[PDB]
Amino acid sequence: IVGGTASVRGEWPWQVTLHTTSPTQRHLCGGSIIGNQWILTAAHCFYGVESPKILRVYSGILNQSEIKEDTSFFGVQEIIIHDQYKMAESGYDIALLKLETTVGYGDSQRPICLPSKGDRNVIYTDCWVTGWGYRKLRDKIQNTLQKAKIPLVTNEECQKRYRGHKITHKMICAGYREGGKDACKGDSGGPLSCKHNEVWHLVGITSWGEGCAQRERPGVYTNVVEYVDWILEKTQAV
Ligand SMILES: CCOC(=O)[C@H]1CCCC[C@H](NC(=O)/C=C/c2cc(Cl)ccc2-n2cnnn2)c2cc(ccn2)-c2ccc(NC(=O)OC)cc2N1
């Protein structure tokens, strides 16, 4: 996260850190708890991930230093990538992880609500991006989960900012015209969380952008409200 500040423990209890153990264990991507065995994240996280056996999901984490060999994690039973996904810049950048065991909810780990059909028309004014990603293009994964408050940008404005790309309504953009606050490397898959009527909603999934926090280059997020039917199809299968 560029231009952000340290989160307080328990502030973003749906935020997870997904680690890969291959070739060595390291943070791979962010993700969000949406159900007791479900993490929503970005499909591009799994480029070259050949098996869910190499993944570890850590919840209730503020600092990456809390993770050692003896730290409990959730194994991944299945990786479900949207089958229209080709690459982040073309959309459908969404994936579900089905956990091997159930998350016991509490003050450190609980799900974030998905947006409702009616929420497609609401204007969110309190949106935050969180993650352990870089604070600049050439940096390292941060120990403490960072947060940044960022305004949503209309589809028309985002399209003007990305000449040569097709910004669809299945994407949602966020960022200041002058830049300065944005997601960066290591933040992808994490949430863009917006508070509406005192309830946090998972509005976006951190996906891509041209550089980090540049002027007139807002971050591009998967627009979660457009995938609620897909998420229910995969998580509520008979
Ligand atoms: C362990 C292997 O992990 C990996 O290969 C990647 C897998 C994911 C690939 C895409 C990902 N993109 C974003 O996170 C965000 C992009 C972005 C989003 C918005 Cl909305 C706006 C502007 C954006 N950017 C424009 N330029 N930068 N960001 C990314 C992540 C890393 C590097 C490059 N790109 C990366 C770096 C270090 C570690 N771990 C580590 O060092 O552990 C000790 C892990 C990873 N993950």
Nearest atom in ligand 1 to the alpha carbon of residue 129 is 20
Resolution (A): 1.9
What CATH number did the domain enclosing 41 receive?
A: 2.40.10.10
* Judgement on whether residues 49 and 132 belong to the same structural domain of the protein: no
Amino acid at the residue 61: I
For residues 141 and 26, what is the distance between their CA atoms, to the nearest angstrom? 9
Q: Whose CA is nearest to atom 9 of ligand 1?
A: 45
* Judgement on whether residues 222 and 136 belong to the same structural domain of the protein: yes
Nearest atom in ligand 1 to the alpha carbon of residue 42 is 8
Give the domain extent around 89. Answer: 13-111+227-238
* Judgement on whether residues 29 and 98 belong to the same structural domain of the protein: yes
* Judgement on whether residues 8 and 116 belong to the same structural domain of the protein: yes
What are the start-end ranges of the E strands in the chain?
5-6, 15-20, 26-35, 38-41, 55-58, 74-81, 95-99, 127-131, 146-149, 152-153, 171-174, 191-196, 199-208, 219-223
* Judgement on whether residues 61 and 105 belong to the same structural domain of the protein: yes
Which of 21, 58, 188 has most ligand 1 atoms within 8 Å of its beta carbon, as the pocket-test mutant?
188
SS3 230: helix
Is there an atom of ligand 1 within 6 Å of 160 CB? no
Q: Where are the alpha helices (DSSP H) in the chain?
A: 155-161, 228-235
CA angle, residues 193, 15, 80, in degrees to nearest 5: 95
70, burial (CB in 10 Å: exposed 0-12, middle 13-18, buried 19+):
exposed
Q: Is 93 a catalytic residue?
A: yes
* Judgement on whether residues 168 and 131 belong to the same structural domain of the protein: yes
* Judgement on whether residues 208 and 235 belong to the same structural domain of the protein: no
Method: X-ray
Catalytic annotation, pick one of 7, 32, 188, 193: 188
* Judgement on whether residues 164 and 199 belong to the same structural domain of the protein: yes
SS3 229: helix
Amino acid at the residue 147: K
Q: Distance from the CA of 237 to the center of ligand 1, in angstroms? A: 31
- CA-based nearest residue to 45, from 131, 112, 110, 113: 131
CB within 8 A of 14, min separation 6: which ones?
A: 32, 33, 34, 109, 110, 111, 112, 191, 193, 200, 202
* Judgement on whether residues 162 and 147 belong to the same structural domain of the protein: yes
* Judgement on whether residues 125 and 203 belong to the same structural domain of the protein: yes
Q: Distance from the CA of 185 to the center of ligand 1, in angstroms? A: 3
* Judgement on whether residues 86 and 191 belong to the same structural domain of the protein: no
CA-CA-CA-CA dihedral for 80, 85, 86, 87, to nearest 10: -90
Is there an atom of ligand 1 within 6 Å of 228 CB? no
For residues 9 and 14, what is the distance between their CA atoms, to the nearest angstrom? 12
- For the chain, how many structural domains are there in total? 2
Please tell me what DSSP assigns to residue 75: E
- Cis amide linkage into residue 23, ω under 30° from 0: yes
* Judgement on whether residues 127 and 100 belong to the same structural domain of the protein: no
CB within 8 A of 41, min separation 6: which ones?
A: 18, 29, 30, 31, 32, 94, 95, 96, 97, 189, 190, 205
